[PDB]
Design a protein around this ligand. Structure first.
Ligand SMILES: [Zn+2]
Ligand SMILES: [Zn+2]
Lengths: 132, 132
DNA sequence: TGTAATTAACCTTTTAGGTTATAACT
DNA sequence: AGTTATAACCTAAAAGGTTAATTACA
């Protein structure tokens, strides 16, 4: 019989909720999400099992959204092809040292100019010596 | 003898202040800035003349910081060379419709991959047909 | 004239860019 | 040992977009 730690006006009751989620303009509903939900407000409390499941769904969704505009495999492929490590790739293309790990895991979207420059150099790798 | 509207503990007194400012890691001091300053806290109040002068200095500083890594003239040049309007350029290179106006005015720094892709296409303009 | 092109405030989301941890590998 | 990649966490900036206010310019 726990009370909502937020509004203090509803009880937390175990059930399920479809959770809308938006990333980079793409909308989805994460459905049947188990948790404790406040009768009164939006406060929700998930256990570890529920949090983990939920976050995995969110991570999965974002990766599929990013994969609409660039395949993580294409990025890794062009990088290893230019014989760059991720840190070397980030120095040239920008984004900070973690940049390419984030693109290649599918968690962050590269700049449109990063993608397009990767496409130019995929067909014309020798051009890297011009701008390195 | 107007009291500080922020801390209520100091009077606003007319004088000058050197104002540190940082942009994209570059630090400067905007010197001798006229205004009303609170004796107690950092609260300052500038009239229109003082605000305008100050903001012009801030805008000037940011533009010179951006110009360290990319000349606005180089950007306009490559864009008009690829026969792109700013909106057309933004669609290909990213950044939203206002992107290129912000770069070309010197107010925002383009992605390192935007700069480098602009460099590739400056020497090899025909390559735009590959990724457009 | 009025239509496209650009500059401008101004707003929210997302990456840039970096620190520190962890772990695998060389 | 240092090298590579992944991971979470930060702040500061640009991405991306809406609206308005301007400047070329048919
Ligand atoms: Zn509640
Ligand atoms: Zn004060």
């Amino acid at each position: 019989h726990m009370k909502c730690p937020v509004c203090h006006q509803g009880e937390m009751v175990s059930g399920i909720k479809d959770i809308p989620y938006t990333f980079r303009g793409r909308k989805t509903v994460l459905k049947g999400i188990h948790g404790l939900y406040c009768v009164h407000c939006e406060e929700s409390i998930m256990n570890k099992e529920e949090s983990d499941a939920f976050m995995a769904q969110v991570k999965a969704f974002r990766a599929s959204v990013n994969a609409e505009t660039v395949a993580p495999e294409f990025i890794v492929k062009v990088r290893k092809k230019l014989s760059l490590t991720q840190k070397e790739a980030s120095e040239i293309f920008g984004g900070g040292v973690n940049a390419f790990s984030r693109y290649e895991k599918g968690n962050a979207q590269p700049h449109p100019s990063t993608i397009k420059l990767l496409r130019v150099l995929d067909k014309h790798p020798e051009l890297l010596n011009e701008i390195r």
